[PDB]
Amino acid sequence: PTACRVCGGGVQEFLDLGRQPLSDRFRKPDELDDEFTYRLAVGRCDSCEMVQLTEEVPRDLMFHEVYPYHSSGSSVMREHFAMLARDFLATELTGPDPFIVEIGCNDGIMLRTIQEAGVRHLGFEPSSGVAAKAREKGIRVRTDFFEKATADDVRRTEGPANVIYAANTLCHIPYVQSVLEGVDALLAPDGVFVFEDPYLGDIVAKTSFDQIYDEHFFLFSATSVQGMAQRCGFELVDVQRLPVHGGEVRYTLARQGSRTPSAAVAQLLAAEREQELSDMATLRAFAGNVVKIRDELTALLHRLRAEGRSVVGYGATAKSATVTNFCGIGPDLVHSVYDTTPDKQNRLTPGAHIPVRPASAFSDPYPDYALLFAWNHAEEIMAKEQEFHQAGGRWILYVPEVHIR
Template sequence: MKKCRICKSPIEPFISFGQMPIANGFLTREQFADEYFFELQAAFCANCTMVQLIDQPEPQKMFHENYAFFSSTSKRMAVHFEEFANHVKKDYLTSSNPFVVELGCNDGIMLQHFANSGIKHLGIEPSVNVARVANEKGVQTISEFFNESTAKDILGKYGQTDAFLAANVMCHIADFNSVIAGIKMLVNPDGIVMFEDPYLGDVIEKTSYDQLYDEHVFLFSLSSIKYAFEQYDMELVDIEPQGTHGGSMRYIIAHKGARLVSKNVYTQLEKEKEMKLNKVETYNVFRKNCEKSRDSLKQLLVDINKRGKRVVGYAATSKSTTILNYCGIGPDLIEFISDTTPIKQGKFSPGMHIPVRAYEEFMAKYPDYAVLLAWNHGEEIMDKEKQFKAAGGKWIIFVPEVKVV
């Protein structure tokens, strides 16, 4: 029996997506034969309520010098992170010479707003190529994986931090307990931890199962975060629901007793009980919903292809790896995936080996249908691609349900 990564209790598997490649592992034809696969299987812990992957590839297989995701590619996310930074500066940095640490700062998209204000800061980013971009922007960044040992080094060199931040990062780290232990050491007595990740409640509600892929080892809820931090005498003091990534939650944590706990926390914890996020039955229903969604999407694409229509994918996202592999969608159903990220262009999608081509190819000759693989940026994309619709193009969406728009 596998044990929970947080509390070491036995965990209950509730879904297997089958053999899955590295989500951001876009590859050349020559690399097909050596492609790495693992079983993508999720489980629920009834004791601490954490939803987690049973197995996760080694971090070095996912985050490295060729990491294919740069945060600054989305204009909407750039605005979101500027607002996040301004909120921290205005409401939480009260000392005369504050120090801010961001875990998984990527290309410096958020931390640059502290750097530009002359605020002492440090970014921690394990992927060497994106860390280099952050440093070039004037954002002081080290390329390391974060744990207790890294926290000790930072403490020795820089002292304690007033705000420890992260966005779409915490759910990536398998040894979450070591991260919390490091945070406890690094955050000063009046300091805060503020991080946001995809919210379990939204995933269950929308059947957005593509939030489960190699990098996302956890799907957090308030109750699981509360439990995890309480083990280290830290407490969840506030939350701020976010619309990003199809539904995220921002958690604000402090040392126990340092701040009052907002009523928002208690209200949302009650909602989680109503949603039965603490019951394994919820996840068995989720599995059935995933299977229905999979079969429906595959059948739709088969039917469209039978009618001789052209279908392409829009945006070669990490999430799309779960969708395409779980649904068995390959180049026979999707001609190519259009993407603006140069590092992905001319390569093939992980596992299913659909060609990834430059965005210009999408524009040069519009297809009949485009599968919106970056559904969480749907509004922004549809706004940008009004010409595609005007030319008679149709979007295929699969969250919260499979439909053509």
């Protein structure tokens, strides 16, 4: 039985996705077929209701020099984060000498807008290759994990931060207590710690189990985040639901009693409690639907092969590692996955070993079907690939249900 990373309570498992590889390791075709594996399973803490994995992968195995995810590969997410930055610049960073720290700045997608406004900032990005992309934009970055000690070091030399922001990063961090202690050390007394990550409500609603993989340790909800804040000295004071990444919530934490929570916080809490979001029965129902999706997706893929129709995938997401390894999908059923990230191209997907090719290679003559792993980017992708669909090529989706369109 595993101890909750937030409160030490007991965590009860509800979903076992089996042996999985690291999601963001893309091997050259000639490399030895040996990968690190671990058991991917998800549970819910009994005391604070935090939904979390039952095995941690060590951080250095995931985040390192060759971490391959480039945030700026999505035009939607570029606009999303530039607007968030402008919003901070108009609200929380209007002082005489403001400072914003970003945990997980990646290639600089959000901090470039802060740097272009002349505002003092620091990104923490432990994956040095993408850190260097951000530095080439003029962004100040430390190639370090944010945790208590490194936060202590920044408070000592740089002073208090008015905003600490994390997007798609806090959920990646099992040592959230250490992060919160760092935020306590580093945040101004009237500052905010704002983070946005995939939302448990949307994952349950859409059965989007591919949001569960090595790098997604936590599936936050307003209920669990409220408890986490409270148990660590802070207070959930705003929440905002966002469409990006399959559905997220952006949570705003402040020092306790310093600000009054928006009505939105109580409203979302009440909705989660009404829909019994975090009840073990709800979470096990989700687990049953995950199995139903596996069985229908494999049945379809095998039917398509028996009917002589060609199938590829689109988007070498980290998420897809869960789909192809839980479902047992490899190159005999999906022959290639198309992806815009150079560091992923001419490599093989983890565990399943499907070849990855540049997106520019998805062109006439098109395959009959494309399994859309980057389903959270559907609109942006389909807008760039109208020729495929006009030629009669169709998308296979597995969220919220297996269907073709």
